[PDB]
């Protein structure tokens, strides 16, 4: 996260860390949506251009963390993966369209003050909150500049009008993504960066006070560059797929 700040303890209990076994290193962010499921970006697991193709036995999921590098004994919980499901139409060849993947944990994780799932939006919630100008929140242990934070970072960013998103890049934007960030003349800055991928973009409903995950950190061109914006996978647009996988495989 660029131009963010340290998160408070328990501020994002759904935040998950994708950890590579060997060499031990941070791969991406992810989110907890149930006691058995984790949501992340498909490019975190599969991306042929960089010969990236991780399997279930290659990674570990670390939940309830605050510190990036320390093993937070008695606080964080580490879990193994039973299966990984990538959207069948994930477009890694062109624009990362449908950049989404689900991961089923081998065993349910017990909730605590530091581990709690985030809600998935319903049509009505998505409709009223996903509007240009409205701010969401991004969290992650990614780089602080385009080095590495000591603890989880957080930043609040406004959703940007689709035309502006389109006119800021050469990449073909689809209905399955939205972009966010400040405009060059708004004064404030902030953006996700390397290491933050797969992380959650959340918003708090003023109707029922619950937090909803509206997006997944997907891609960008550089980090916190003026005139550029971060792009996120539109979670609701792909909920039909999410629901299918969940009730069909457990």
């Amino acid at each position: 996260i660029v131009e963010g700040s340290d998160a408070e303890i328990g501020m994002s209990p759904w935040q998950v860390m994708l950890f590579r076994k060997s060499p031990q290193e941070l791969l991406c962010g992810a989110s907890l949506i149930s006691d058995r499921w984790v949501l992340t970006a498909a490019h975190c697991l599969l991306y042929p251009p960089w010969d990236k193709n991780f399997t279930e036995n290659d990674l570990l999921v670390r939940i309830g963390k605050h510190s990036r590098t320390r093993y937070e004994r008695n606080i964080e919980k580490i879990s193994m993966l039973e299966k990984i499901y990538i959207h069948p139409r994930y477009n890694w060849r062109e624009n990362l369209d449908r950049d989404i993947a689900l991961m089923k944990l081998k065993k349910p994780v017990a909730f605590s003050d530091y581990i709690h799932p985030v809600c998935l939006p319903d049509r009505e919630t998505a409709a009223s909150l996903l509007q240009a100008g409205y701010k969401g929140r991004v969290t992650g242990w990614g780089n602080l500049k385009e080095g590495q934070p000591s603890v989880l970072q957080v930043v609040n960013l406004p959703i940007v009008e689709r035309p502006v998103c389109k006119d800021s890049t050469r990449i073909r934007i689809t209905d399955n993504m939205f972009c966010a960030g400040y405009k060059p003349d708004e004064g404030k800055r902030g953006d996700a960066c390397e290491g933050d991928s797969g992380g959650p973009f959340v918003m708090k409903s003023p109707f029922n006070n619950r937090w909803y995950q509206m997006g997944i950190v997907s891609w960008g061109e550089g980090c916190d560059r003026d005139g550029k914006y971060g792009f996120y996978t539109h979670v609701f647009r792909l909920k039909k797929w999410i629901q299918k996988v969940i009730d069909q495989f457990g």
Partner: peptide
Amino acid sequence: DCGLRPLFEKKSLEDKTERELLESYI
């Protein structure tokens, strides 16, 4: 029970920047 944080919503405590979010939902 999703989306309600044990250390915040559950105890009616706000984190330091969530107000910025709500303030933008005009």
